[PDB]
Write a protein that binds this DNA or RNA. Structure first.
Ligand SMILES: [Mg+2]
Ligand SMILES: [Mg+2]
Lengths: 219, 209
RNA sequence: GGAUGCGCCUUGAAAAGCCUGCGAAACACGCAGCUGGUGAAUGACAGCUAUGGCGCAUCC
């Protein structure tokens, strides 16, 4: 019933700016405190900013004061985070959160948005290069190498989502070159290598890329 | 500025176990402390508010306690759905601050990895670069070298998955990167794996096929 | 939404200040009465009303 839906993430260069929005449903933001919370990749939650009801008083983490401004458009039932002069360490998934009703959940944050990814980097939006990982006990491994894309994220499926069992898609790692790379693998019966076609489907929405790649034994 | 120091940082346990997580505020926070559960890729969920009150709808296995500036989250007996990262939070004063998290993982029996090695595709070869990939499949626990003609350590990067939901194992990839020049110069590409499983297993290919 | 009943809440402390409960409310703003208790400046309350808010049940 209660929902927070964030938008506005994406790729920005250092020194740049970005506005995140947080659209509420099922309650009116004017009666609650709204918070923004950050999670750097593989890191913990970091509180960023908040805005109080009735007064509109705003509060900010030291890391962020003077660069971020939290606000709210009550007529749109939406809160905003304006992020200026961004730094590389500001890279994180940004969450909207509602502080619950005092009598029902104290100061706990009872509802959270889905999160939007903000990456602050000089590197430029680039689709990936997808390379087969050719196969060859009684089971065989094969995969797809997804190299040199930016920024996150990329999604990988197999045979249009029909192949699921035994798939492992590893988390992206940032290579020295400043682009991402990640492999997705699957184990299958080796007896089926001659009779079943395996294609990995690689979508990179930042570049609007969609790739199908068939993986085959090499001669 | 108030700090929340949370321990343990990580924990392996089994279904039915009692787990306790503690968080110590550097100053008084007057039981303005909340606990959250977060699963990978998902938003945190509120468990406990006001140090000891059960948020509406979370199972009674979850409880919270305060002793002065010491706050404890207890899960009575672990369920399979309870493995996740947990966070404490103080909201007594601004700025709010979080504990750094406790990752609760499921304990299981040791399992050696199945190893596979993949040569660089020809399409990548004609591109200019050649990357060689070694796969460690379905092993436990997480802890785990490249040789191109017994040459210990281009450089390489590894990636590891989260615990598989089905069999609680991990998988890992290590990708070795060279220029096309240096790829077509040395005979055998070997991935040697060392684990809590027997004796250092090695897998290899030579560019002739 | 209207009728009826129930549950929780609707603060204690007084000049100011500080702290605490509440009002959809961490700041700013607002919070009735009587008894008894307490206050040579001290949160210390207990009982019962009034008013209002939310929820549950029930009737339209
Ligand atoms: Mg009174
Ligand atoms: Mg009273």
């Amino acid at each position: 019933e209660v929902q927070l839906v964030e938008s506005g993430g994406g790729l920005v260069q250092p020194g740049g700016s970005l506005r995140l929005s947080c659209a509420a449903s099922g309650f009116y933001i004017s009666y609650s405190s709204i918070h923004w919370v950050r999670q750097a990749p593989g890191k913990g939650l970091e509180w960023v900013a908040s805005i109080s009801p009735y007064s509109g008083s705003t509060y900010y983490a030291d890391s962020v004061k003077g660069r971020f401004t939290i606000s709210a458009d009550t007529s749109k039932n939406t809160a905003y985070l304006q992020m200026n002069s961004l730094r590389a360490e500001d890279t994180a998934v940004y969450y909207c959160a509602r502080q619950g009703y005092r009598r029902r959940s104290g100061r706990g944050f009872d509802y959270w948005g889905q999160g939007t990814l903000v990456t602050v980097s000089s590197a430029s939006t680039k689709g990936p290069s997808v390379f087969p990982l050719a196969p060859s006990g009684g089971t065989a491994a094969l995969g797809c190498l997804v190299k040199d894309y930016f920024p996150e994220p990329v999604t990988v499926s197999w045979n249009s989502g029909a192949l699921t069992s035994g798939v492992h898609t590893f988390p992206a790692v940032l290579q020295s070159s400043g682009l991402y790379s990640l492999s997705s693998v699957v184990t299958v019966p080796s007896s089926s290598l001659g009779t079943q076609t395996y294609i990995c489907n690689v979508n990179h929405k930042p570049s609007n890329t969609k790739v199908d790649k068939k993986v085959e034994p090499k001669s | 500025d108030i700090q929340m120091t949370q321990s343990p940082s990580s924990l392996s346990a089994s279904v039915g176990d009692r787990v306790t997580i503690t968080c110590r505020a550097s100053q008084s926070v007057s039981s303005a402390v909340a606990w959250y559960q977060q699963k990978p890729g998902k938003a945190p969920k509120l468990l406990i508010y006001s140090a000891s009150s059960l948020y509406s709808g979370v199972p009674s296995r979850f409880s919270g306690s305060r002793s002065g500036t010491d706050f404890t989250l207890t899960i009575s007996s672990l369920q399979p759905e309870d493995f996740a990262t947990y966070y404490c939070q103080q909201s007594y004063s601004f700025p709010s601050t979080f504990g750094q998290g406790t990752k609760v993982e499921i304990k299981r029996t040791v399992a050696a990895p199945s190893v596979f090695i993949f040569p660089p595709s020809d399409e990548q070869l004609k591109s200019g670069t050649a990357s060689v990939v070694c796969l460690l499949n379905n092993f436990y626990p997480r802890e785990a070298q490249w040789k191109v003609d017994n040459a210990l350590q281009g450089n390489s990067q590894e990636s590891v998955t989260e615990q598989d939901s089905k069999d609680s194992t991990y998988s890992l990839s290590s990708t070795l990167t060279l220029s096309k020049a240096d790829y077509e110069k040395h005979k055998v590409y070997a991935c040697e794996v060392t684990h809590q499983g027997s004796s250092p297993v090695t897998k290899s290919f030579n560019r002739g096929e």
